[PDB]
Design a protein around this ligand. Structure first.
Ligand SMILES: *C(=O)[C@@H]([C@@H]1NC(C(=O)O)=C(S[C@@H]2CN[C@H](C(=O)N(C)C)C2)[C@@H]1C)[C@@H](C)O
Ligand SMILES: [Cl-]
Ligand SMILES: [Cl-]
Length: 247
């Protein structure tokens, strides 16, 4: 009923990791040609905590259930001064995602509740579909795990409005995922940094929109310290540049 030609390996991309003495994986998917490429087929399929990349499915469910009315609704800061300054202020869905404001999304999670969260992730075919742990932190220190190639599968459904939520919900999240746009490309993506449970990793998942194609990407990389957080985007763009996807 369905055909997949199989990922193609390209170890030459490891130079962009070793150049910064880093370890990780980049996965690319050419949508027009239905071809996949990665520097490490084993790590492409290794599943990790999604950490803040969970804001994508969390946003979708919150919108679809009415927990979030639209992208303008204001979520008032609760008063708790936290170590990331941009969290210590009011937010809407756009800025809550831009600044990765965990406490706003923890509230979403509590209002969604266990049963609806579990049912929706099953409908999404998201990762291992396991929400064991605190309803408001399981994507940070509980049971859910997702690999880079699984992030691509999920993102392809979101891109095509094929997830089992409303088209509007999907359009709103793709708007909030907007990260960069110029005359050559649009990037819709979400960063992540998983620290509560070993191993500490950085994530960047999303896609590059071109005039007549879309390249999906999912990367993660070992991140012992926050010093190399910028390497998530930098390494990914080096691979994009090498493959001639962006100038
Ligand atoms: C998500 O995984 C964690 C938060 N999300 C992110 C992120 O998207 O990178 C961070 S990192 C923090 C916020 N922005 C700063 C940054 O990106 N640089 C200085 C480069 C640092 C949060 C930790 C969530 C689980 O806390
Ligand atoms: Cl989060
Ligand atoms: Cl947009």
């Amino acid at each position: 009923n369905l055909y997949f030609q199989g990922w193609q390996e390209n170890k030459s991309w490891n130079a962009h990791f070793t150049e910064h003495k880093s370890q990780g994986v980049v996965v690319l998917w050419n949508e027009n040609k239905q071809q996949g490429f990665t520097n490490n087929l084993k790590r492409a399929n290794q599943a990790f905590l999604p950490a803040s990349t969970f804001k994508i499915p969390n946003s979708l469910i919150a919108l679809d259930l009415g927990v979030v009315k639209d992208e303008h609704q204001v979520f008032k800061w609760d008063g708790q001064t936290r170590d990331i300054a941009t969290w210590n202020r009011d937010h809407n869905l756009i800025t809550a995602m831009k600044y990765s404001v965990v406490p706003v999304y923890q509230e979403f999670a509590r209002q969604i509740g266990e049963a609806r969260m579990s049912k929706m992730l099953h409908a999404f075919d998201y990762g291992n579909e396991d929400i064991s742990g605190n309803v408001d932190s399981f994507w940070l220190d509980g049971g859910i795990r997702i690999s880079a190639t699984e992030q691509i599968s999920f993102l392809r459904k979101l891109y095509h409005n094929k997830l089992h939520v409303s088209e509007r919900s999907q359009r709103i999240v793709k708007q909030a995922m907007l990260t960069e746009a110029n005359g050559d490309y649009i990037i819709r993506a979400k960063t992540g940094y998983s620290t509560r449970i070993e191993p500490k990793i950085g994530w960047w998942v999303g896609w590059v929109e071109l005039d007549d194609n879309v390249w999906f990407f999912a990367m993660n990389m070992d991140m012992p310290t926050s010093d190399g957080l910028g390497l998530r985007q930098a390494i990914t763009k080096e691979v994009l540049k090498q493959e001639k996807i962006i100038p």
